[PDB]
Design a protein around this nucleic acid. Structure first.
Lengths: 62, 97, 83, 97, 83
DNA sequence: TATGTGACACGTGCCTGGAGACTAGGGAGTAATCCCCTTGGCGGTTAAAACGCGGGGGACAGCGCGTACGTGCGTTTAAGCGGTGCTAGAGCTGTCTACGACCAATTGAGCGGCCTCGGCACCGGGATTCTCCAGTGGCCAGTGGCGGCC
DNA sequence: GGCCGCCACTGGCCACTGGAGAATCCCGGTGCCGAGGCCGCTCAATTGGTCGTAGACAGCTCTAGCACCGCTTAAACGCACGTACGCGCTGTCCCCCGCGTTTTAACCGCCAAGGGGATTACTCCCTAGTCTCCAGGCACGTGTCACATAT
């Protein structure tokens, strides 16, 4: 069940990134944007996952 | 005049780039050399799988990055945009080290 | 064979790259050597664990299996190395 | 003239007192009421050993106190002495809560 | 029979006492209810697991070693009641 | 200091859990080897690291100031003691069966090996997109002239 | 006749605007090598049957929690009131950052050495298990001084 749902998330992310085959960046973006999965795996690190695109508001100009 | 971007513009651009990117950010050979150097301090003549070195690089980069977002949270919490040594010291102590 | 100052091998622009991936907009000049010491302390902790695993394995060859054991032992579990 | 201490002086005095003391700072029976209320929201007719309620207590202010030294360090980090709830949010986020 | 408000049973002076134990000398007025919510969050985070252990023991009454278990699950190991 | 008390520390029955003798067998220690994986080394090749330099943006000092919270004090209440009743229910103990570990077989699903190919990496040319900087008018206050007044 | 207030010009400052320039993506084309799918092996998953036993159940019990009731008193609560604290403004120096230039060493690519991880084989050291037994620590009980409270 859990592999099926994370594979749904990964396939959705790959189709968002227009890729047929899933990559660890898709895995990172999928696992960080599901709050139950993210707080399930806050201390679990993915090889070559990268980070979420996240910029604080005061970092933006004006 | 020659072109010149204002400060922070290129910084935000590379922030977006490296958030977009997934690759390792430090050079492979000096990292492996440092790993061998510090592992020699505990026991002599240690041989390394390159996969082990890459795992160390990956875990180290992720650990450092997470510490850096904590530093960012401290800096914006301190009403500043420039990170400071006391921010990292605070973040380490709050995490419990 | 015998090396000394490879903590400086983690160069300052590499630290800037890590910071920009970390969402840092501005970096103080005093940051880099501190972060060098921090990543240092972290790395001899984890490779002390790795060395202890490896000598327990009666090996001089460090395996990534030992590495991922060490990282999950410090509560920093890493995926993708045969664990 | 009725004596009045300047602000912070008393607060420091019971800071020293409660750092000296080990006794529990929570009214026990309202705390037990809150425990039974929250636990009833998941399972009805829950009965409690009093020692379990006690253990839940010192666990609770152990978490709360450690949160307050974290937030106090955050507040003095921000060059302030009066604590804000955003300090608490910062501490919770850095701890990964 | 049912209860509706006991979060206010954790009074503002009790929170003030805890902050003095925390070394906090000056407390904003916005602090108290937000801290009530935070501690309450910690409370169902522990008591859900406590109830889960209690029902899995086929007991209807909560026992203390179940609380000891549920607290060491959160990395919050408590001494003096195990066993 | 006084004290009086109950927690704490120690005497005592006990039984059960640790230990002594033996056994069987099997997990681990050890020899070989080999080969695969790791180490060691040269030479382009830049990307990256470093160096420098103006210069804007940001930490930070100072101040005012208006506030929200420390401090003090009387009140109500509800926390806390303590005392009784009583029961859910945790928990302890016979029972016998579901159920699952264990032994012989055998296979077929799951893993090693290969191959290829198409998803995907790389590159180069447009299109885009943003942003930063030169103008661009409005606004506001500075400023000189003018007319009335004394 | 000079002065003063008014009035109209004016210059500088500040928000708005268009365009240029460079970064960024997107589109199309090209190679190229991991995906994955097919094929052969094998070992372990399954089937079947057995023995023993783990635990669910039944049943009791006694005990700890729940409720209540009354007293008491300190804690909470709420109001008064001062003061110090966030904190925004202003400014000011100076600190990294963008933009180059140099330079250097990382990396790839290739090549040679060997060594120790892993694998198989053999062995035997050790230990789990069984029977017997007895004493070590635990429950229970009971005096007693450390110290909490009081002054």
């Amino acid at each position: 069940y859990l592999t099926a749902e994370i594979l749904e998330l990964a396939g959705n992310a790959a189709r968002d990134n227009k890729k047929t085959r899933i990559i660890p960046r898709h895995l990172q973006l999928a696992i960080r944007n599901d709050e139950e999965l993210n707080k399930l795996l806050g201390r679990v690190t993915i090889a070559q996952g990268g980070v979420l695109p996240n910029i604080q508001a005061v970092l933006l100009p004006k | 005049k020659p072109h010149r971007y204002r400060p922070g513009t290129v910084a935000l651009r590379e922030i977006r780039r490296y958030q977009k990117s997934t690759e390792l950010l430090i050079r492979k050979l000096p990292f492996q050399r440092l790993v061998r150097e510090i592992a020699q301090d505990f026991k002599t003549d240690l041989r390394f799988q390159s996969s082990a070195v890459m795992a160390l690089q990956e875990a180290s980069e992720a650990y450092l990055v997470g510490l850096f977002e904590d530093t960012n949270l401290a800096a914006i919490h301190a009403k500043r945009v420039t990170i400071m040594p006391k921010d990292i010291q605070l973040a380490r102590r709050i995490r419990g080290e | 064979k015998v090396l000394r100052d490879n903590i400086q091998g983690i160069t300052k622009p590499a630290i800037r790259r890590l910071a920009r991936r970390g969402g840092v907009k501005r970096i103080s000049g005093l940051i880099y050597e501190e972060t060098r010491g921090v990543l240092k302390v972290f790395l001899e902790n984890v490779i002390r664990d790795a060395v202890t695993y490896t000598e327990h394995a009666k090996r001089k060859t460090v395996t990534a299996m030992d590495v991922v054991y060490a990282l999950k032992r410090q509560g920093r579990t890493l995926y993708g190395f045969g664990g």
